Amino acid sequence: SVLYNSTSFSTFKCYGVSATKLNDLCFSNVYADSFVVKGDDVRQIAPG
Amino acid sequence: FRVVPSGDVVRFPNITNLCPFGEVFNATKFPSVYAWERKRISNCVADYSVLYNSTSFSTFKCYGVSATKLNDLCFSNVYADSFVVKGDDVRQIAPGQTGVIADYNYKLPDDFMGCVLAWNTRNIDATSTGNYNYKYRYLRHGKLRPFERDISNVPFSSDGKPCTPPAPNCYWPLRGYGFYTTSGIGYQPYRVVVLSFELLNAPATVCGPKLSTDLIKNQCVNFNFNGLTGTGVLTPSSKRFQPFQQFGRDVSDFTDSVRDPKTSEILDISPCSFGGVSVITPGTNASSE
Amino acid sequence: LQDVVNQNAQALNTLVKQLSSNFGAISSVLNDILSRLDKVEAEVQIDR
Amino acid sequence: LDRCTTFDDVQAPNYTQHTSSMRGVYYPDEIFRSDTLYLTQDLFLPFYSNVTGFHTINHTFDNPVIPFKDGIYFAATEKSNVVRGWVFGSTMNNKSQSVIIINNSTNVVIRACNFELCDNPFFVVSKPMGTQTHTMIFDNAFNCTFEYISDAFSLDVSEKSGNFKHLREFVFKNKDGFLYVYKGYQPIDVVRDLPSGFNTLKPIFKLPLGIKITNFRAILTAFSPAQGTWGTSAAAYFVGY
Ligand SMILES: *[C@@H]1O[C@H](CO)[C@@H](O[C@@H]2O[C@H](CO)[C@@H](O[C@@H]3O[C@H](CO)[C@@H](O)[C@H](O)[C@@H]3O)[C@H](O)[C@H]2NC(C)=O)[C@H](O)[C@H]1NC(C)=O
Ligand SMILES: *[C@@H]1O[C@H](CO)[C@@H](O[C@@H]2O[C@H](CO)[C@@H](O[C@@H]3O[C@H](CO)[C@@H](O)[C@H](O)[C@@H]3O)[C@H](O)[C@H]2NC(C)=O)[C@H](O)[C@H]1NC(C)=O
Ligand SMILES: *[C@@H]1O[C@H](CO)[C@@H](O[C@@H]2O[C@H](CO)[C@@H](O[C@@H]3O[C@H](CO)[C@@H](O)[C@H](O)[C@@H]3O)[C@H](O)[C@H]2NC(C)=O)[C@H](O)[C@H]1NC(C)=O
Ligand SMILES: *[C@@H]1O[C@H](CO)[C@@H](O[C@@H]2O[C@H](CO)[C@@H](O)[C@H](O)[C@H]2NC(C)=O)[C@H](O)[C@H]1NC(C)=O
Ligand SMILES: *[C@@H]1O[C@H](CO)[C@@H](O[C@@H]2O[C@H](CO)[C@@H](O)[C@H](O)[C@H]2NC(C)=O)[C@H](O)[C@H]1NC(C)=O
Ligand SMILES: *[C@@H]1O[C@H](CO)[C@@H](O[C@@H]2O[C@H](CO)[C@@H](O)[C@H](O)[C@H]2NC(C)=O)[C@H](O)[C@H]1NC(C)=O
Ligand SMILES: *[C@@H]1O[C@H](CO)[C@@H](O[C@@H]2O[C@H](CO)[C@@H](O)[C@H](O)[C@H]2NC(C)=O)[C@H](O)[C@H]1NC(C)=O
Ligand SMILES: CCCCC/C=C\C/C=C/CCCCCCCC(=O)O
Ligand SMILES: *[C@@H]1O[C@H](CO)[C@@H](O)[C@H](O)[C@H]1NC(C)=O
Numbered sequence: 001s002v003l004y005n006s007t008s009f010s011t012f013k014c015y016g017v018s019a020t021k022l023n024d025l026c027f028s029n030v031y032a033d034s035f036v037v038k039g040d041d042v043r044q045i046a047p048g
Numbered sequence: 049f050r051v052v053p054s055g056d057v058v059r060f061p062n063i064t065n066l067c068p069f070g071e072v073f074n075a076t077k078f079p080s081v082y083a084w085e086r087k088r089i090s091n092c093v094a095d096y097s098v099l100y101n102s103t104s105f106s107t108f109k110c111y112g113v114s115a116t117k118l119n120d121l122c123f124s125n126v127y128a129d130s131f132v133v134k135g136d137d138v139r140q141i142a143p144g145q146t147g148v149i150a151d152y153n154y155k156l157p158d159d160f161m162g163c164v165l166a167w168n169t170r171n172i173d174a175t176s177t178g179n180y181n182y183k184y185r186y187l188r189h190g191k192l193r194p195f196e197r198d199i200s201n202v203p204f205s206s207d208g209k210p211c212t213p214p215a216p217n218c219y220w221p222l223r224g225y226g227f228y229t230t231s232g233i234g235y236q237p238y239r240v241v242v243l244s245f246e247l248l249n250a251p252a253t254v255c256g257p258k259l260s261t262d263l264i265k266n267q268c269v270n271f272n273f274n275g276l277t278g279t280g281v282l283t284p285s286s287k288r289f290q291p292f293q294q295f296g297r298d299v300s301d302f303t304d305s306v307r308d309p310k311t312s313e314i315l316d317i318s319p320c321s322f323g324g325v326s327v328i329t330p331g332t333n334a335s336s337e
Numbered sequence: 338l339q340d341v342v343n344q345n346a347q348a349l350n351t352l353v354k355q356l357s358s359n360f361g362a363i364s365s366v367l368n369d370i371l372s373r374l375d376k377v378e379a380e381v382q383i384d385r
Numbered sequence: 386l387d388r389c390t391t392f393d394d395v396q397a398p399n400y401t402q403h404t405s406s407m408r409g410v411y412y413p414d415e416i417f418r419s420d421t422l423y424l425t426q427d428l429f430l431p432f433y434s435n436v437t438g439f440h441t442i443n444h445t446f447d448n449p450v451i452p453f454k455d456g457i458y459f460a461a462t463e464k465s466n467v468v469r470g471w472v473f474g475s476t477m478n479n480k481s482q483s484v485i486i487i488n489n490s491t492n493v494v495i496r497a498c499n500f501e502l503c504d505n506p507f508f509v510v511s512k513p514m515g516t517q518t519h520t521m522i523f524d525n526a527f528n529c530t531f532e533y534i535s536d537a538f539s540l541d542v543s544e545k546s547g548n549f550k551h552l553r554e555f556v557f558k559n560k561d562g563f564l565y566v567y568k569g570y571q572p573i574d575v576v577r578d579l580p581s582g583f584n585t586l587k588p589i590f591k592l593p594l595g596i597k598i599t600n601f602r603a604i605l606t607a608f609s610p611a612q613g614t615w616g617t618s619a620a621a622y623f624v625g626y
């Protein structure tokens with residue numbers, strides 16, 4: 001929730017878990033991958 | 049023994065006025081999301097094709113019903129909710145979302161039935177100097193429940209105790225959108241309308257554009273009562289519905305009785321095919337009779 | 338003999354009553370399904 | 386009486402205990418059924434639950450703030466129309482939205498606003514004349530979001546004597562921004578208690594208020610023998626969860 005005052009996301013999608021349960025869980029072996037793409041290429045960042 | 053229908057019956061209520069598409073979608077003013085507004089819709093014809101010549105919707109999504117069936121149904125207990133959000137926030141107006149809007153401003157139920165519409169309004173709601181009249185809440189203790197609104201303006205502290213605005217760890221909970229003419233699409237204003245209703249379980253007074261016919265009795269026909277379609281034989285009934293009841297059901301959950309929406313007469317509905325049939329043959333090798 | 342009769346009748350009546358189960362579909366009424374949904378999703382519900 | 390007053394020398398409530406008796410059943414949906422048994426799961430009042438009684442008599446004028454929890458069953462036994470409605474809310478002041486549902490002498494009024502609620506809301510009726518004189522529910526209202534006014538009628542507001550004659554039952558629920566209201570009625574002839582029996586309630590309202598409801602208070606009637614002096618008439622109402 002600290003992000004609410006500083007960031008706005010055009011895309012936010014979650015797989016394997018409901019977005020409304022995130023606050024009630026603990027997560028194992030967490031990694032974050034970062035990069036930059038073009039606007040039309042964002043849709044390609046998804047399974048399949 | 050099988051019987052096929054030989055007729056067609058359509059029964060809708062007496063409706064003359066067109067629904068207030070102009071009032072809803074063309075209103076001069078829209079409210080802030082944190083103070084979203086609700087309006088009842090009743091006793092009108094929902095002929096939405098009239099919008100085709102005046103409106104273009106960036107977002108249109110329906111839940112609980114197929115968009116291609118809307119013209120053939122009648123809707124019960126219809127409300128329309130209106131407010132304004134940012135371009136990046138539109139995605140949050142959907143069941144099971146998280147974020148500032150879905151948490152503190154406006155939330156839909158998990159079993160939502162209805163439709164969501166949204167369109168860009170930069171030319172109307174954005175100015176070169178920046179328009180700050182639209183606001184949203186970004187601080188709150190706990191999340192809103194579905195279709196709940198909070199319009200308080202109490203100063204906010206994480207500790208939870210009362211504080212005075214000019215003091216550390218004390219903030220005003222409402223913030224203003226900044227809508228500029230030169231902003232990017234993600235920071236441009238959008239107008240949103242959310243329609244909610246129920247289907248085929250109770251009385252209705254909003255319907256699609258359809259022509260009603262006469263009532264045919266004691267004959268296997270196709271029928272459509274207030275959007276509920278089927279095949280059967282209609283007879284007069286001795287059951288007495290209460291004013292809030294529109295359909296009756298048997299132990300198999302089959303719809304076996306209905307109140308006519310024009311005369312208020314109660315009708316029983318019965319299946320067409322009925323009866324046992326047997327075939328006696330001496331053998332196809334011997335005869336075909 | 339009485340319970341033979343009763344067993345037969347109960348079996349048939351239970352068969353009639355069991356038509357009210359959803360089996361995981363949005364409804365147990367084919368007419369409701371076909372009045373609300375288009376063919377593609379109606380097919381899934383009817384298959385259930 | 387232009388503003389709202391506080392009664393002086395009022396006895397504290399006695400939260401008398403009673404039991405429900407197969408009361409509080411309502412129609413679960415709008416589908417017609419007959420000659421059948423139907424199993425369903427919902428918010429119901431369990432048989433023989435403990436209920437709390439509140440009384441107006443002599444110098445006892447019971448109208449505390451009562452928790453709402455997950456829904457309410459509210460039954461009034463009376464003979465002279467003392468209980469007139471309710472106020473539902475969370476903080477019960479002008480810091481949040483509250484909804485008033487009242488039956489004044491001529492109309493049923495429902496309003497959702499920021500109310501400057503008065504801790505002692507009541508109607509005033511003159512014993513010698515039998516006419517309603519004042520209403521003192523709230524001092525101010527603003528930011529109103531919902532209003533409903535029914536067709537006009539006439540009520541017998543005069544005081545009566547004898548045994549309690551009318552039992553009026555209500556069920557209140559709050560779900561997805563809607564306040565469900567169910568109602569039922571019975572003629573009775575009793576003295577003090579809540580009669581035992583069975584009676585199904587019917588839906589009346591489904592109000593699209595969209596407010597948080599955690600507390601509620603009842604609105605009562607005060608019978609004044611003379612201008613300035615405050616009196617009461619016998620009446621009882623009972624609450625269950
Ligand atoms: C029927 O009896 C039950 C108990 O058998 C009563 O429910 C009890 O109500 C009290 C008063 O609100 C509850 O106490 C409060 O609960 C919480 C947790 O502490 C909090 O709000 C307060 O600090 C206070 O303790 C109590 O928990 C509750 N008991 C149970 C088991 O739920 C009920 O009120 C009776 N029915 C009536 C009076 O109509
Ligand atoms: C019970 O409550 C109802 C609802 O508030 C009261 O009726 C309303 O009374 C007000 C005045 O107190 C009326 O306002 C005025 O009415 C006329 C309209 O031509 C005119 O003088 C003003 O323009 C103003 O609107 C209001 O119309 C009226 N509402 C209705 C629906 O009739 C009623 O008086 C209350 N009864 C008692 C015994 O207090
Ligand atoms: C709920 O009621 C409150 C209290 O009345 C409303 O707040 C008030 O809203 C007005 C109208 O927008 C604010 O405008 C003020 O008016 C003049 C100039 O027009 C001047 O005092 C200020 O520059 C300002 O523009 C007013 O400040 C504000 N008052 C307070 C004490 O907060 C509020 O709008 C209502 N909420 C809803 C959702 O209707
Ligand atoms: C959220 O961000 C806002 C905007 O930056 C913060 O409010 C600003 O605070 C600064 C520092 O005091 C002021 O100079 C600005 O005028 C404020 N902007 C306003 C009031 O619109 C706010 O403090 C942040 N909140 C939290 C909890 O960090
Ligand atoms: C649909 O909208 C169009 C565009 O506004 C309407 O056609 C215009 O009609 C006005 C009034 O006669 C003319 O001045 C314009 O020149 C027309 N625009 C054209 C022809 O491109 C049209 O009448 C509307 N249709 C309906 C059925 O309302
Ligand atoms: C809907 O309109 C129809 C058509 O006018 C009404 O049906 C007629 O009502 C009149 C007045 O009672 C009768 O004399 C006629 O016999 C009815 N039938 C026809 C074919 O005219 C009907 O009452 C209206 N329904 C409602 C609910 O207002
Ligand atoms: C909301 O209610 C409170 C409490 O009754 C009101 O507080 C009063 O405010 C006025 C104006 O400042 C003072 O003169 C009074 O002394 C305060 N208390 C009382 C008991 O009257 C408050 O004004 C109400 N309204 C608002 C908008 O805050
Ligand atoms: C003015 C209030 C209307 C109330 C709606 C009535 C009934 C229930 C729903 C009807 C569907 C209307 C949505 C039309 C969308 C147009 C789509 C487009 O143009 O791409
Ligand atoms: C992000 O980095 C910028 C650049 O240093 C800095 O000004 C800002 O405070 C940081 N935090 C946020 C929330 O943007």
Ligand SMILES: *[C@@H]1O[C@H](CO)[C@@H](O)[C@H](O)[C@H]1NC(C)=O
Pocket residue numbers: 074102
């Ligand atoms: C909408 O409102 C505008 C502004 O008043 C008006 O010009 C227009 O005719 C209305 N109707 C449509 C379909 O835009």
Ligand SMILES: *[C@@H]1O[C@H](CO)[C@@H](O)[C@H](O)[C@H]1NC(C)=O
Pocket residue numbers: 333334335
């Ligand atoms: C099959 O065919 C003949 C000619 O129809 C029929 O009469 C005869 O009974 C059959 N043959 C047998 C049963 O062997």
Ligand SMILES: *[C@@H]1O[C@H](CO)[C@@H](O)[C@H](O)[C@H]1NC(C)=O
Pocket residue numbers: 399445
């Ligand atoms: C209230 O209860 C007390 C005991 O707690 C009893 O002594 C008293 O008489 C009661 N008063 C009334 C008015 O019922």
Ligand SMILES: *[C@@H]1O[C@H](CO)[C@@H](O)[C@H](O)[C@H]1NC(C)=O
Pocket residue numbers: 442443
């Ligand atoms: C009320 O007052 C009357 C008259 O004095 C008295 O007889 C009666 O007992 C009182 N009732 C209660 C509950 O105090």
